[PDB]
Symmetry: C3
Subunit: 149 residues, 3 copies
């Protein structure tokens, strides 16, 4: 009994793992996930940057980061409005870094941006043009999370 | 050996349970659930009120209920068309109650409504501009379910 | 007590099976699955027919198959562009068969189709007005999967 039931439950668990992996694949597919491409998702809610980071972290994703022109357009299409990107110069003013780590390998700044305007701007938003503007991290913009290809 | 295998399987189970809850969270987020707000969803199918109650119940949710103007608007944008709300005046005519208990607080009746028209109307539908109209529970309207915030 | 832990693990597994089934049901509902009707999903990616088949198969579904006008309309709405159907005459030229088996019955061919044009056309795409056209299985069209009623 004991050993047999234990062996069966191991098989029951592996079956459930396989099934959950399928559920995730189907949901990603339904979410527009393209083959071999990372995918962006939004609930269309606008919130401060800290909340966006906390939200994506919960979902085991990261705040969306465009690494090239295609991903930048992809993010733009998903958000439809201004949205925070996983980029900030919070650590050292003027030096924008990825929340995931490292210096920018790609950027699409609007003319004369980033400008740390007025009281200060350490976060980044992709606007209704695909272009970027640094803005207050306390301002509320669309939450867009990224998940791996 | 056996106690070690069992312990390892219990760990696998805890991990799988967390992964499923994550799947639930990402799905709700992808379908528009806002932080700290109830999740409203529809399959766009129109059916009698009894069927909407049975369907939402099966999904472990309930027929959508607007507790305030914000939720009323939220439901309005999910439904697109006329939809049943989880409210009825089946016990005492004119006394609308939530199907989950309690007397109706917030309301958004259309002019001349509720009129318990014809042979009687004890259900409620959210219609044009998010206003309400009592209607026969036998009529078919869009099924919208709500899940906790 | 080993047996007590095993019985709890059994209950944990059954609970998980029940919850995964609920998650699947809620997801199908959110994707527009109507009661007792099969449902359709797409990620809007265009690809050759063999890729669509592989993709849907992996998700435990099949390339969308319109069995009647209602389903045809539903697939058209979901796809929004030209998309492959789970129908081909690859096995015997002129005789279209469902990828899951059986000879084609209901059809919605555009005038003058199918025509196995040029070197040949053994696949089928739902196109404009929802009509059908046979086309090369090598061409890239939208991937649409169907899942059981
Ligand atoms: C003058 O500064 C520009 O306009 C302000 C209204 C802000 O949007 C700021 O981020 C931008 O750089
Ligand atoms: C006159 O009454 C109004 O029109 C009828 C056709 C019904 O829709 C009824 O619920 C509504 O209040
Ligand atoms: C003449 O043939 C028609 O036009 C060609 C350009 C193809 O689209 C073919 O499938 C269609 O039947
Ligand atoms: Ca700063
Ligand atoms: Ca700055
Ligand atoms: Ca700026
Ligand atoms: Ca009555
Ligand atoms: Ca009444
Ligand atoms: Ca009425
Ligand atoms: Ca042929
Ligand atoms: Ca010819
Ligand atoms: Ca042919
Ligand atoms: Ca043709
Ligand atoms: Cl800031
Ligand atoms: Cl009634
Ligand atoms: Cl072909």
């Amino acid at each position: 009994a004991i050993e047999v039931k234990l062996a069966n439950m191991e098989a029951e668990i592996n079956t459930l793992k396989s099934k959950l992996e399928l559920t995730n694949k189907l949901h990603a597919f339904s979410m527009g996930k393209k083959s071999g491409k990372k995918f962006f998702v939004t609930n269309h809610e606008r919130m401060p940057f800290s909340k966006v980071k906390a939200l994506c972290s919960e979902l085991r994703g990261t705040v969306a980061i465009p690494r090239n022109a295609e991903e930048n357009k992809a993010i733009q299409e998903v958000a439809k409005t201004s949205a925070f990107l996983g980029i900030t110069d919070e650590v050292t003013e003027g030096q924008f870094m990825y929340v995931t780590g490292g210096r920018l390998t790609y950027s699409n700044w609007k003319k004369d941006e980033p400008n740390d305007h007025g009281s200060g701007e350490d976060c980044v938003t992709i606007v209704d043009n695909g272009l970027w503007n640094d803005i207050s991290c306390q301002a509320s913009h669309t939450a867009v999370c990224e998940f791996p290809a």
